[PDB]
Structure formats: C-alpha cells, structure tokens
Amino acid sequence: YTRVVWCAVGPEEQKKCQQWSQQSGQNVTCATASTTDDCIVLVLKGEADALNLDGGYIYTAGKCGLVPVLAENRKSSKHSSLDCVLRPTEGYLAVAVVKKANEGLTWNSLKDKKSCHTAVDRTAGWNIPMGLIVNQTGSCAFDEFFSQSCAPGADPKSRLCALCAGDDQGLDKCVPNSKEKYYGYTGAFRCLAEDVGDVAFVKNDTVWENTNGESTADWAKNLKREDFRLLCLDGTRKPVTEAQSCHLAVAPNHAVVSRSDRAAHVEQVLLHQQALFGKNGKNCPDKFCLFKSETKNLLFNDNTECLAKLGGRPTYEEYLGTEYVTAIANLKKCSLEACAF
Ligand SMILES: *[C@@H]1O[C@H](CO)[C@@H](O[C@@H]2O[C@H](CO)[C@@H](O)[C@H](O)[C@H]2NC(C)=O)[C@H](O)[C@H]1NC(C)=O
Ligand SMILES: *[C@@H]1O[C@H](CO)[C@@H](O[C@@H]2O[C@H](CO)[C@@H](O)[C@H](O)[C@H]2NC(C)=O)[C@H](O)[C@H]1NC(C)=O
Ligand SMILES: *[C@@H]1O[C@H](CO)[C@@H](O)[C@H](O)[C@H]1NC(C)=O
Ligand SMILES: NC(=O)c1cccnc1
Ligand SMILES: [Fe+3]
Ligand SMILES: [Zn+2]
Ligand SMILES: [Zn+2]
Numbered sequence: 001y002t003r004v005v006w007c008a009v010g011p012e013e014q015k016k017c018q019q020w021s022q023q024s025g026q027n028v029t030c031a032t033a034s035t036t037d038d039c040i041v042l043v044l045k046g047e048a049d050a051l052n053l054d055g056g057y058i059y060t061a062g063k064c065g066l067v068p069v070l071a072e073n074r075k076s077s078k079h080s081s082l083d084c085v086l087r088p089t090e091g092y093l094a095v096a097v098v099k100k101a102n103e104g105l106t107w108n109s110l111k112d113k114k115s116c117h118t119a120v121d122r123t124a125g126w127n128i129p130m131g132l133i134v135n136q137t138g139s140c141a142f143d144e145f146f147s148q149s150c151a152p153g154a155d156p157k158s159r160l161c162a163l164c165a166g167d168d169q170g171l172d173k174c175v176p177n178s179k180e181k182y183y184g185y186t187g188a189f190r191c192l193a194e195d196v197g198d199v200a201f202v203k204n205d206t207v208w209e210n211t212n213g214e215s216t217a218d219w220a221k222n223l224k225r226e227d228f229r230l231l232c233l234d235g236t237r238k239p240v241t242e243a244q245s246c247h248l249a250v251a252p253n254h255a256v257v258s259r260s261d262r263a264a265h266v267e268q269v270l271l272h273q274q275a276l277f278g279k280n281g282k283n284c285p286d287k288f289c290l291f292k293s294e295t296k297n298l299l300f301n302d303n304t305e306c307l308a309k310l311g312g313r314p315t316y317e318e319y320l321g322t323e324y325v326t327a328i329a330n331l332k333k334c335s336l337e338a339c340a341f
Helices: 012-025 036-045 056-062 123-137 184-193 204-209 240-245 264-278 314-330
Strands: 004-009 029-031 051-053 065-071 092-099 114-117 148-150 199-203 228-231 249-251 255-259 306-308
Touching: 004 036, 004 051, 004 065, 012 029, 012 306, 029 036, 036 051, 036 056, 036 065, 036 255, 051 056, 056 065, 056 123, 056 255, 056 314, 065 264, 065 314, 092 123, 092 184, 092 204, 092 240, 114 123, 114 184, 123 184, 123 199, 123 249, 123 314, 148 184, 184 199, 184 204, 199 204, 204 240, 228 240, 249 314, 255 264, 264 306
Parallel strands: 004 029, 114 148, 114 199
Antiparallel strands: 051 255, 065 255, 065 306, 092 199, 092 228, 092 249
C-alpha cells in the first residue's frame, strides 16, 4: 500500500514537505493544515497518514484512536553500541529560563510576570508549567497568573496572546504554527531573548542550540549561555549547565502517529525514507536531509538523530507514562474521556 501522506502544519512545513516529496519520487506526499488539531482531524478522516507530535498532542491524538509509531531520538553519551533505531529514548528536560540580569526572579515570584510558551497544549511550553501552577495556586484561573503572555493557540484577544507578533506583516497573531514569530521551542526562547517576556517555558536543548554561536539567526547571533538561568522548583536559580538537577520534569519524545490500521505501513516507509534522508542517509547532506531546517524544527526537531522503533508496541498511555497522563488529566479538568472532536 506503499504511499504515505504527511500532514504539514503551516506554510513553512508545507514547503519542507513538498521538497521531501520530490526527492522521494512521491513515495510521500503532502497535506497541509493551519493547526496541529486540524492535521489530527485529517488523519482521522483518512485524508492524511501521519505527522510527528509533541507529547501534549499525542494525548489529544490518542483519545481519538491514533497510535504512536516511531519516536524521535537525539543522542546520549552512555547508550553507545546500540543502534539509534533500536536504542531506547530518553525524553527531554522541560525547564524554565530567565535572563541572568533579571536578578531576583525565582519560581516563587512568577505571578504577574511576562511569559513565553511554545504553544497551548504542549508539554514543555504549557502542560508541565501550568500544571504546576494550577497545582500550586489551588486555582484553575491560569489565564490570570501572568500579566501578559504569548501562548500560541489561545484567544487572539486575551492577555495570553498579548506578547505574540504574528508574521512578517502582523497577520496571524498567536496562531499555533511557525507563521507566529514566537511559536514553538524556538519562538518562545526568542520571545525571552528579545526581552519580550521574563520567562520562557521550553526544553533544555533549546538554550544550548540558540546560544554561543550555534544558531546563526540574527536574533541569536550574540546570545551567550552565561546570560541565562534556569528556575528550579526549590526557589533557586541555576546556570543552564545544571539542568539535570533544575528542571520541571522530563518529557516523552515527540513521536510520529497515525491511525492503527495504517501504522505498519507508515512505519515501513519511514524507516526506508530515513535510511535515505536521515543523519547518515545515502542522500542526506548532498541532496536532502529530513532532520535539518536551519534552526526551525520543521516537521521534526533539528536535533533528531533518527526515528526509533518503540519496543513493547506501546499504547499512547504506555508511551506517555501514567505520570504524565495524570498531569494532563488534572490540568484538563480546569478547561471525563472522549475523542475531543
Ligand atoms: C499538581 O498537583 C496534583 C495534585 O497532587 C498532582 O497530582 C497527582 O499526581 C500524583 C503524582 O504523579 C499522582 O500519584 C496522583 O494520582 C495525582 N492526583 C490526582 C488527583 O490525579 C499533579 O501531578 C501535580 N502536577 C505536576 C506537574 O506534577
Ligand atoms: C540541554 O539542552 C542542550 C541542547 O539541546 C543539550 O546540549 C548538549 O548535550 C549533548 C549531550 O547531552 C552534546 O552532544 C552537545 O554538545 C550539547 N550541546 C551544546 C550546544 O553544548 C544538553 O544535553 C541538555 N542538557 C540537559 C541537562 O538536558
Ligand atoms: C519509492 O518507493 C519505492 C518502493 O519502495 C522504492 O523502490 C523507490 O526506490 C523509492 N524511490 C525514491 C526516489 O525514493
Ligand atoms: N511506552 C512504553 O511502554 C515503555 C516501556 C519501557 C520503557 N519506555 C517506554
Ligand atoms: Fe515538546
Ligand atoms: Zn526529574
Ligand atoms: Zn503495553
């Protein structure tokens, strides 16, 4: 049944997809939508086959019967012989970052400050930090905790979208796709780097990849690691070198999902496609690389080493872990079980 339709979210992923489609001789084609939720609906309709999702969206996707297929895998020193494709995944660290110069700003003096989020419903940018905040404050009124935010996905007219910028021209303010200047892990850290916000909720890989000459992008050009700090839950402030001990939680890797009746087929074309355009593919650097997009994390995060088999053909709760499934459940009570479409 060898022909896979990828769902791209927004015009930039649409363009990267169209490119990949060409280089594959149409073994993969593209469908496009404005939001991740819409791409999820397309897959359900059967109009698209798969897409890579942050854990927060896997949860939405799972209640509707979509299943995790292969997971993103970057690389950790001690997990060495084992192949990337068979190596277990580690999950990433969700952290809260602040400007060093913002002396005296801790996890406990966050109320009324200005925040930068990857996008509503996402693990590091939303579910983990707001989960703790509802928790800590005993209030479901998370829309009144920060004076202002850029939380792609919220009501364009609420304070939660006040700090968002939209595209080149001011259009699409607060859309949960890359047209929004402060969308995703990158847009969010940018929102803080330009001091639009006091804190950004991203993952720890983001600070390292957009500081000390790693980014090339004009806004990240002069960023230095020592000018940032991580906020720990114990009210303390640490250098970004100490994330192992100052994170809010460890998140499950983004993963490709698809309808169960389509999973095997999706899995097979991907392992092949990967063999050709992944980290060491026949054709990567020279013609095309699935995992690169010059600091934008288009379709896939730019630090993905390979997509890996899951082992224990896990359901989505098994993939997310009970720990995280319950964090999302408790937070979702504020805004009991069904495909939400
Ligand atoms: C926010 O507070 C809630 C309430 O204690 C935390 O909740 C529960 O999480 C623990 C540990 O994972 C579970 O054993 C309980 O079953 C959960 N309680 C309920 C009523 O569901 C919640 O996880 C905290 N937020 C974070 C980010 O950890
Ligand atoms: C925090 O995020 C950064 C960037 O994504 C990670 O940085 C690298 O660590 C890997 C191995 O862990 C090395 O191969 C790279 O050299 C590091 N990057 C840079 C630019 O120095 C880092 O692993 C993460 N740290 C934690 C605690 O999660
Ligand atoms: C497309 O898929 C077919 C079927 O597996 C494969 O034989 C062929 O090499 C692929 N072509 C390209 C250009 O990827
Ligand atoms: N998703 C799972 O079932 C699982 C099992 C063991 C380790 N990691 C993930
Ligand atoms: Fe994420
Ligand atoms: Zn931990
Ligand atoms: Zn299982």
